[PDB]
């Protein structure tokens, strides 16, 4: 394995299993882990058993409780402590990786490995282990020769590349605030400094990938409940290498940026961070610049939830995000003008407005507006009031116009965002000659809420597809381990309904096409569309269901049910139509593509969301199956951010389904050893008296089908559904087995009563026999004669 | 047969009464009549039919020699009994007896019920089998 | 099955005995039909004497003995269990795989699970087969099982 001392480089990733193998009893017969309502599984020692009720004893207070012998788990030995990758253990259930993860992170490691997978656990708080000192002890190595650490995903993605010749990805997955963004930003940071090109106002290539970062997260990241620093965009970088081996450019695209949180944020949360940064008074001179005084709390678009973060210097993160606009190379204009666009928003929110008609309670706002805009404020104040289309002069009300000055704002901020992602693009577009690339991923995870959305729909069928890649390299591994055992699984069935799935969804029928042709029509509305979903997909697919119960108290409204890889999904489709296609007053558009100020203009100069999607979605999809995956599966320990804590329902609850050994229609294996001592009786007269022959003459026993499993050289594969069924017949011959025995039993009590059963039916016959005689006597006319003469003599 | 016997004698002579070595109708309707409650004129003649023969003393042994003979020893009866009290408690359950009477072997009618638990020593629920053989078999 | 006659014999004498205990009358009582068969050294399950036409309770149905050969050729067709498959059976509630069993899981098998028994007829059967317990409580199956299926009279 590896070499290393009492290098403080190492403090928080080796484990010097021997300063801590160094003081208890173990017996794999008698501990085991059993269910805990407050820790997820407790440790615990069998006293006895009464078939399937089994009594242990607690072994943190010596308490005694029952238990179903199925939810007992099997627990690993002590040699296998805090190990740093799971594969290697011997029980690879929940409850041992759960311990064995919880162990590590209590100790300060939170990167541990299960197999080809990374796992890491938020820290939740600021570690020493990403220091160059590190990554020059990281470099070059092979996992085995070096603690479990995310700069090896990324060293040994880098390896292949150059090895394998082909591009690398690294996924890294899981729930908000589980870490994705930071790790993500850990991986980038790695290659920029191990693999940087050889040899204010713009830096390297390198300095400009990193520098992206702060001015993304400041207009697509905002303070969520779960996260104070929440990605509302999903991410998909490339790292493009040369010749030499060292980066030769990059780009970026991003998906579905959260357009809402512009004019609207919950309880506890707050809009992108970009506007606290805007209202800080970090650079004063800028101040004037944007026509904006310096109180957040007084704009309402985002006043809302709350204002402040802790952990979160508003003030000293805009230094931070003008300074990195400098080094990606944004002249003072182009940077003025995206301060200025984004000031603009907050002062479109603050436009007031009178009682048929609607009419300007005012107009020193809308001449801030359309200052920054350049634009004239009357026209702005006419075209928002009554639009004049094709003119044709519609007649507004009060609501018509400030929903109109709302989508005024989140069609800005959108195109914006776009164009910072390409703006960003550009400089990182060296045409520098290139080879292969490393791609990481970051986006959201699956997700079901009391209210699911559009928003939801777009994310979960991203997920959809991303799953199906997933699933596509895991039968990879699937048939490598066959050619190992030496079998072959000719025919196979395990892909249908997640296509199926993605199918309802993105074909020419599907969900979001029946939405797209919809949206192109003045006319349409939220029944209009719930009509055509419903007449080409109810009773006509199975995926496609209509809502149940409540799986959940405050479950808002839904339509209908969406049965996802990861659960059914409760939809509504109120404001879909509004969601898909942009509702900008196209008389204000007019006026903004005739703007003064360049970017304005650039923004509206003369593809819907959904259809926007699924075209970059189509392209991520095929640089994936280019690449050679790599997956990181991040997870938060608990929900108060609190660095250390373990909240065990939900940690187990984030190893139900991502490839830690810890729900697919693969064919399931089991090791000759356990299924002879799981099935030798269902044919306990075949068996003679080697594991391997004892689990042969048993399925030689039943007869099966030579077509439904399997000869593995070291364990049996059986075909989905099969190992079910033998499970089946184990209760019934089980059960007909223990009733012979007890037939057997009643047949030895009455063959024992037998003999007696026949001596007393003599006895029983000698006196009735001999009753009817003193009796038949007793009326004889002589005995009674006899009778009354012998009392006389 | 053999202390029974002479008392068969004395009795043989208590019932011939005109004291002539036969029994007859007369001697039979005089000595009933005498201890109490005679046969019919038609049963008494069913009584002498049964010695085809005039009945003196070797006539009225025959008779009672063959009528009581067949059945068990005190002993067997007693033993048969004893197949029934594992306990070799000496007593039976009246239930328990009269259920293997009544319901099982050669069932007995009700009124062999009646006429074998009229007399039949009972105490305490418990029948004194040992008390009841010694009781059918003339002690 | 094709009864010699030794064995058709051997049925009419063990049918006679227990015409005789329910009351000789040339019938049998139905209650009555599984234990005449276990008397003829057959181990039938209770389910298998309800389908010959057994009946759960004495008072209800009787039967002659040519209605009782046809019901004994179907019992004995019915599985009779092995030692081997006693011993995977036990074996699956041995967790330390020694060959032991404490009483107290023992009786809950016999009195819980499969066609149950009852607390006398356990109580009878380990008395009979002399079973014991060592100190801890626990008892060697397997020995249990040779008793059982060697008889009364070994
Ligand atoms: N490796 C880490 N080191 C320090 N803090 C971390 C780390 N991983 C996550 N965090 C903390 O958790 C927060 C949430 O992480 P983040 O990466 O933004 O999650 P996600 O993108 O998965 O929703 C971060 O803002 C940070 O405070
Ligand atoms: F909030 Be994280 F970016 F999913
Ligand atoms: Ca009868
Ligand atoms: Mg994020
Ligand atoms: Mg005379």
Redesign the pocket.
Known sequence: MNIDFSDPDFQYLAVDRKKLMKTAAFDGKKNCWVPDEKEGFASAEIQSSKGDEITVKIVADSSTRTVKKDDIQSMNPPKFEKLEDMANMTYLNEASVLYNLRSRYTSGL?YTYSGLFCI?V??????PI?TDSVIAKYRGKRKTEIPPH?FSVADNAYQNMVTDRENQSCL?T?????????????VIMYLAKVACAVKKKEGSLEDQIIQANPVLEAYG?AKTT??????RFGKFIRIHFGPTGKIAGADIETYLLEKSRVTYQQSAERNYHIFYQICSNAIPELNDVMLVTPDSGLYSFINQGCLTVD?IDDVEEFKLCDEAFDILGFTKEEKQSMFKCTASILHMGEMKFKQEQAESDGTAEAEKVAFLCGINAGDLLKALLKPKVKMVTKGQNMNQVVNSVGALAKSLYDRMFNWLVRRVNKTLDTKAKRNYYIGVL?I?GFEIFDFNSFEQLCINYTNERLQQFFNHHMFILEQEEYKKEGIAWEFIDFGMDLQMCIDLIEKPMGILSILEEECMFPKADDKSFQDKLYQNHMGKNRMFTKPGKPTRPNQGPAHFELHHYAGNVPYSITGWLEKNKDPINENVVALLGASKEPLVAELFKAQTISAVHRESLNKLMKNLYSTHPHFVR?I?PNEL?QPGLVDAELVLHQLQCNGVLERKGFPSRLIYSEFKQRYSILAPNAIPQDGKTVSEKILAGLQMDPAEYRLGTTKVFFKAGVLGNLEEMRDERLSKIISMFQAHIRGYLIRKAYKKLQDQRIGLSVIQRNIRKWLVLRNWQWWKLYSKVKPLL | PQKQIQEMKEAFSMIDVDRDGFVSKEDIKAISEQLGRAPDDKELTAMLKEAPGPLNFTMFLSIFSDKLSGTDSEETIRNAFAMFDEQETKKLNIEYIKDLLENMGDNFNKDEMRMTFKEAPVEGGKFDYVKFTAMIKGS | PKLSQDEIDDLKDVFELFDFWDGRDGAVDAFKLGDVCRCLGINPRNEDVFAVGGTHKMGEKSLPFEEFLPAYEGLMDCEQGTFADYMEAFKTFDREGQGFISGAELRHVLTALGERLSDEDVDEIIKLTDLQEDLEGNVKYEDFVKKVMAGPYP
């Open positions: 939170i890491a938020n820290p939740y708080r600021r570690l990403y995310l890294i899981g729930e908000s605030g589980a870490g994705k963004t930071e790790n993500t930003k850990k990241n779960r996260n104070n620093n929440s990605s952990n970051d959201a991040c938060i951010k």
